C-alpha cells in the first residue's frame, strides 16, 4: 500500500475481521500524525498533546508499529526533543518517556543511519532528577517510578548517540572520578547509564577502546566492595555482550570468576565468620551470568574451564542437605545461566541479519563448546532438582539445557523420575521429577536426531503418573494435572496402531512408538476414573481449574474414536450419580462441557435432550414456582444444562425451541439456587450466540478428526508454531444466531424490564426477593448479550475543557456490525434502573441485595462490551506463565503449541474489544456517575464499598470526568452544608481517597482540582456531621494525608514548547505516506495557541497562589481540631515550589510556627523554612581559572591521578593558609574535595572575589521583603529563646540523632543573613555548650554545623569574628563530650567540613588536632575526640596530606600508652590515614602517609616478639611494650581489612607470622583480648582479594611460618590457607607454581609431630581436593600408600603411617556425596587400618563414620 509497515503485530492478521484492520489503522495513524503535529505546534500539552501521545501508545499496544521507517524517526525525534525540555513537568514527562522507550525498545528497526539522538539533553535531564539539589529539602516531589523509567529511557536512546559522545562523556565525568568520595558513585552511575557499548566495529576506537583499559584497571585495582563497583560490573556485562569478537577478557577472566565466587559468599573453613565483610551488594548474578556467557567461546575456552571449575567449587552447596542463605542466589545462577546460553545460541544462529553488529565466526559457540557447558552445569542442576526450596529453578535449567543437548539432559531426569514416581516413602521426589519433566517435555516428545528414544518414554510415564490424581495431595494433583496437560497437547492421541500394512517408510522407534499408541483408551479412561473418584470425594477451585483444564486438553487431542467412549463415560457419570451444586457438581459440569466444547454436535445430543427432559419432569407440578427449596435433582440437572451450553453457538441452534421452553418455566422460580442457575443458563446461552471465540484449539490445524488413517499422525508430535498456515476455526455470529440472541432477549429481558419500569412507578408493589430476581435476570442478560447492544450515547457534556486540536474516541471494529435499527437495549435498561434506583434509595433503603445489582448493572452498562476486564487480565497472566514454561527460546519464530498460539490471537481480540480510549463523557454517563455517587454515599457500608469500585472504574474511562465530579464529592464535606450524615461524609471521603491503583480525586494533577479539594479536606474538620471519635474516620484522614504526601508530584506553572519541538512537529503533520488531507495551520491560530497557553499557565499561577492562601485561611479557622491543622500544614508543606519563592503569608506562617506548641508542626516548619531559605538564596558568581595559571607548571598529558604538581597548591599546607584579609582575597579556594584528583574539567569554577559576590551585612531595608520576615523573627531575643527552648528539647530519649534536617535550617540562615543573628544567638549557644545535658549538646551541634557551613561565602573579617567566637565554644564542647553525645559532635564536625576547602576552615583542625589524646576526662574522651576529629579528616580526603602526617607523627608515640576503647579508635583513624596511599593505576605516589613506610617502623618496634625460642603471651623492656603495640596494630588491621583499596600490602604481610603464633586453635573463647583479637584478625584477612603478583609473596610467608616450632602457628597457617584459597581461588589456580606450593605445603604439614596440625592438614587437603583446586594425582596415591606401609615401630615411624592413612582419609572425605571410580579401591586401604593403633584408629573410625553418614 502507501507505506511499508515496520514490524506489525502478527496476531492482527489472524483475526476473522483482519480485512478491516488495514483501512482502520491507516486512519488512526493519520489522526495521530495530524493531531500530534497540530498539538505540539499549538502547544496544547495537557488536553491535546498528552492525549494523542496516549493514543499513539495504544496504537502500538494494538497494532504493533505499522508506520514507515521515515515516520518512525519522526515520532522518535518529536517525543525526544519534547521529553527533554529543560523545565518540563516531570509528571507528564513520564508519559512522553514511556512512549519514547516504547518507540526505541525494538532496537533492530533503526540503524544509526536513520537516527542520531543527542546525549546532552538526557544528561541535563538526569541531573535535574537523580542528583537534584532541592528534592532533599522538599521542593520537587518526583514520582516514585522515575529513576527506573529514566535509566531505561537513556538506555533506549543510547545506541543512537553521536559517535563523538563517548569522548565527550569522558571529559565530563572523568573529572568526577576521585575514589574517596561520593562523586565517584556519580561518575560510574553515569557511565553505566550513558556510556555507549553497542557501536559497529568500524568505530570501536570512538567507543569502548577509549575508556575500557582505564575503567577495568580501575575495576581490578580495588579490593573493597564499593557501591560503585557493582555499578561497574553492570557496565562490563553490557559491554561484553554487545562486542564478543573483540575484547579478549583473557587477562581478566580469572578475576571475574573469582569475584563472582566471592559474591556467592559461601561459608568456608572451620567456622570463620565475616560480620565486617560486605554481604549486601555489588554482584547480582543476573549480570554476572550475562558477563560470563558473553566471554565464553573463541579460540581459548579458558572461560569454560573457569566455569566448570566454578561449578566444581559449589557442588557441595547445591546438595539438598546443604541448604542455607547462599542457596537463593546459587539457584539464580543455575536458572539464569543456561537461559542466557540459549539466548546466545539464538543470537548467533537463529536470529536474522540486521543492523546490530553480528558475532564473528571466530567467537560463536561451537558443537563442543555448548556440549561442554551442558557437561559442566548439569550435575548441580540434577542436584538442585531435589532441593527443599521447591525445584522451580532447576526445572528451568533443565528446560534450557534440553533445547541445546537433549541427549545429555533427558535420560538423567527420567532415570530419576521413574523411581520417584514408583516410590511411596520419598514423596518429595514426585513433585521434583514431575515439575522438571514439564520443562523438558517439548524436547522429550520431539526426538531431535541425536536423542531419538525420547518420546517412547511418554506414554509409559503418562500412564504411571495417574495415581497422582489424588484427593489427598493438593500438591501432587496439581503437578499431575499440569503433567498430563503438557504431555497431551504435545501428542495427537489418535489410535495409530493399525499400521502393519506399512512394511517400510517407518523407523524402529516409530514402529515401537505406534504400537504403544493403542493404550490411549487405557489412558483417557483410567485417567477418568481417577478424576471421578476425586470428584466423589470432593484450594479446591484450583483443582477444578486443573481438572477441567487437563481434561479439555486431553479431549481435544483425542480422535473421534476415543472421544465417543469418553463422552459415554462423561454422560453416564453426570446422569446417574446425582451431584451437589457447590463443589462436586461444579466439577462434573465443567468436565461435561469439555466434552461438549470438543465435538459440539454429538456430545450436545446426549446432554440437552436428557437434561431438558429431566428438568421438565421435575418442574411440572406448578407449585415448584413458589417452592423455596428445590429438591436437588432439579438443582444438579439445572446446573448441568446451565454450563453445558457455553459452547459453539452455531451447533446449538438445533436445540433452540426446547431450550427456550426450559427457560420459560425456570427463570421465574422463587429459589436463589435455580433462578441463579437458570439465569446463568441464560447468560451462557447469550454469550455463546453473540460473542466471537475460537472453537477447536487443537494442535493440528483445522482437522484432527479425519477418516483416512492411512497417513500418519504420530510423526506429528510437536509441530510448533506455524502462524501462517494456522487455520483458527472462529465462531463469528451468523444472522440466525444473532436473531436467536435478540429473540431470547425480547422474551426474557423485555418482560421484566417492563416489570421493573412499573416498579419504579406507582404500579407493581413488588417484593424485595422479586426485585432481586428481576435484577438478576437483567444482569445476566446484559452480561451475556453485551456485544450486540451498542454503548450508551447522548448529548456531550459541555463545560469541561477547551480543546483546540480534537478529543476523539478510538472506533475499533471487533467484528459484529451493531444493528442500529433495533432499539438500543442498554439505553432502555439504564432508563429503567435509574428510576428503580430512585425508588429503592427513597422507598426501600434497606434492600441490601438488589441494590448491589443496581451497582453491577451500572458497572456493566457503562463498561461491558462483551469482554470482562478482570477475566482478560487473568487470562493474560495465565498466558505468560504457560508461554514461559513452554518457551522454545533457542528457536526464533514464535514456535509455540498451537493451543496457546490460538489463545494469543483470542487475547489480541479481547485486548482489541477491551481497550476503549477517552470517549466523550456524554451526559447519559454523567447520570450514571451522579446516581452512583448516591450509592457511594449511602446507608450501608457494603453497598458503599461495592459502589465505589464501579465509581473509581467509571472515572478512568471517560476523559476529563474526574474533574467533572470534583465539586459533587466535595459537597458532603463542606463545613456549612447542614447535616449530610455520618455515612454520607465517610462515603464521600472514601470516594475522595480512591483505591491503591486507580484515580484518587484528592490528588489529581491539575490545579483546578487541588484548589478545590485540599481546602475542602482541611475545612471538613468543622463540619458537625463529622466525628473523629469514630476510629475509622481518623484512619481515613491519616490515609488521605498519607497518600497525598506519598503521591504528590509538582504541578505546572510553565508550559512553553520551544522552537525545536514545533520545528520537528510541523514535519510530522505534513508527512504524506498516510494522511487525512488537512489544511496548513493558519498563523491566526498559531497565535490563538500562544494566547490560550499564556493564559492557561497564568491561572496555574493564580490557582497556586490561591491554594496557598486558602490553605492558610483554612488552617486557622476559629475552631478546628489539631488533626486538621496538622493535615493542612503538611499539604501546605507540599507547596514549596523552587520555580517561585513561597507566598509572603506562608513565609510568615512557617517562620512564626518554628516555635509551635506541637512538635509535629515544628518539624514541618523546620523543613519548610529550610526550603524557604533555599528558595531565597542569592546566586554566588563563578569565574574560570586555568589550573596551570595559579600553579605554574605544564599540566601534563597521559592523564595521571593523585598528588601532582598542578594539584599541589590545592593541598592543605600549614605554611600557606592566608591569616590576613589580603592573602585571603588573593587565594583560590577550590571548595569540593574531588576537583583535580583525576583530571581537571573543561572549564572550572572558582567562586570569584567578594567585590563581585552578593553583598552581605544588609540593613533590612535592602532585603527582598521576604528576607524581612526571617530577619524580623530571627533577630529578636524572644523568638530565639522560644526556638532554642523547643529546639533543645528531648524528643525520643536514646533515639535522637544529629538530624541533618535541622542542620539545613541553620546552614541557610547563615547563608542569607549571616551576621546579625549570632549576637542574638551568642548568649543562647554560649549557655548551651556548658550544659551537661544530651539534647542541649544536640542543639548546639546542629547550630555550630550550620554556622560553619553557612560561613562558606563570607568576608575575612566576618569569618575571623566567627572563629574568635567558635574556638572556645568548640573547646568547651569537645571537653564536655559524653557517651550520649560523642557521635553527634562526630556528625557535627564531619558535617561542618564536608565539601569545603581545608584552608578556609583551618581553625577546626587546629582546635581539634591539638590534643585529641590528652588525658583530662581520662579514657573515652581521648577516644571520642579522636573520633570527632576522624570524621573531620575523613571528609577532607587526599587534600590534607600533612595534618595527616601531623596526626601520624603525634600518635605513633601513643600506641603503647593507651586503653582498650581508644586503640579501636586509633585503628579506625590509622585506616583513614592510610586510605589515600592507593595502588590505583596511573596514580602518582601521594604526599599523604604511606602504609609501607609506617609498618616498617612498626616492624622495627615489634622485632623482639618474632625472634627465636617462641616465648610469647606474657602481657604483664622492649617486649611487653611490643605486646601493647601489637594490640593497637591488630585493631588497626581489623578496620583496614574491609576499607582500604589495596588490602594487605607486602609489608602488612610480615605482621602475619607473628600473628600466627599468638592466635588460638579451637575456640573463640575469652583469651586475654589479644589471642581472640589475633584470631579474628587472621580470619578477616585471609578473607580478602589478592593480586597475582602477591600470591607468591603470601605463600612464601606461609611456608616460612609453617616451618616454625609453634604448633599453634602451623595450625592457623593451615586454616589461613584454607580460607585464603577458596576466597579468590582462581587467582591461585592461575598460577601453576602456587598450586604446587600449596600442595607441597599441605602434604608437608600432614606429617608434623603435633596431631592437631596433622588433622587440620587432612581437613584442608580434603577441602582443597573437594573444590578441585587440587587434583588427586596418581603420585598423590603413590605417596600416601607408600606412607601407609611404613612399619610398626617395634614417634618418627607411627607419625608416617598416620600421615599416610590421614591422606587417604582426606581423599575419601573429599568426595562426600559421590563414590568415584578411585574410591572403592582406596576405601579398602583404610579398612586395613582399623586395628592399626591409636591415633590411626580414631582417624579411620571418624573417617569411615563420616563416609557412610553421607553416602
Ligand atoms: O505482546 P506482549 O504480550 O506484551 O509480548 C510481546 C513483547 O512485548 P511488546 O510487543 O514489545 O509489548 C515483545 O518482546 P520484547 O519487545 O519485550 O523483547 C515481543 O518480542 P519481539 O517479537 O519483538 O522479539 P523476538 O521475536 O522474540 O526476537 C514478543 O516477544 P516474543 O514472544 O519473544 O517474540 P514473538 O512475538 O514470538 O515473535 C511478545 O509477543 P507475545 O504477545 O506473543 O508475547
Ligand atoms: O555549601 P555546600 O553545603 O557544599 O552546598 C553547595 C551550595 O548549595 P547551597 O548553598 O544551597 O547549600 C552551592 O551553592 P552556591 O553556594 O555555590 O550558590 C551549590 O552549587 P549550585 O548552587 O551551583 O548548585 C552546591 O551544589 P553542587 O555541588 O551541585 O554545585 C552545593 O553543594 P552540595 O551539592 O554538596 O550541597
How would you portray this structure in words?
The chain has 77 helices and 4 strands. With 1751 residues, it is mainly α. Among the domains are: 1-161 and 1059-1083, no CATH class; 165-195 and 199-267 and 277-397, no CATH class; 492-719, no CATH class; 749-798 and 823-861 and 916-961; 866-915; 1557-1748, Alpha Horseshoe (Leucine-rich Repeat Variant), CATH 1.25.10.10. Helix 16 packs across helix 17 (406-415) and helix 64 (1460-1473) crosses helix 66 (1520-1536). The chain is globular, with a radius of gyration of 40 Å. The two termini are 71 Å apart.
Topology (elements, then pairings):
Elements: H1 20-41, H2 45-63, H3 69-81, H4 90-104, H5 120-127, H6 147-157, H7 165-169, H8 183-194, H9 212-221, H10 229-242, H11 253-263, H12 285-295, H13 303-313, H14 327-350, H15 367-385, H16 392-404, H17 406-415, H18 417-420, H19 428-438, H20 441-444, H21 458-464, H22 474-484, H23 508-514, H24 521-524, H25 526-536, H26 545-556, H27 560-576, H28 584-598, H29 600-618, H30 632-644, H31 657-660, H32 663-666, H33 676-690, E1 693-694, E2 730-731, H34 735-748, H35 750-760, H36 768-784, H37 825-843, H38 850-861, H39 869-885, H40 898-914, H41 924-936, H42 941-955, H43 966-969, H44 982-993, H45 1010-1019, H46 1031-1047, H47 1061-1066, H48 1088-1096, H49 1099-1115, H50 1122-1133, H51 1144-1152, H52 1159-1175, E3 1201-1202, H53 1221-1225, H54 1267-1274, H55 1277-1286, H56 1300-1312, H57 1317-1326, H58 1335-1350, H59 1356-1375, H60 1382-1392, H61 1403-1408, H62 1422-1435, H63 1444-1451, H64 1460-1473, E4 1483-1484, H65 1491-1501, H66 1520-1536, H67 1552-1556, H68 1571-1582, H69 1591-1600, H70 1607-1622, H71 1625-1629, H72 1632-1645, H73 1651-1666, H74 1674-1684, H75 1694-1709, H76 1719-1727, ...
This protein binds ligand K0W and inositol hexakisphosphate.
Inositol hexakisphosphate binds at residues 133, 1174, 1177, 1179-1180, 1311, 1349, 1352, 1395.
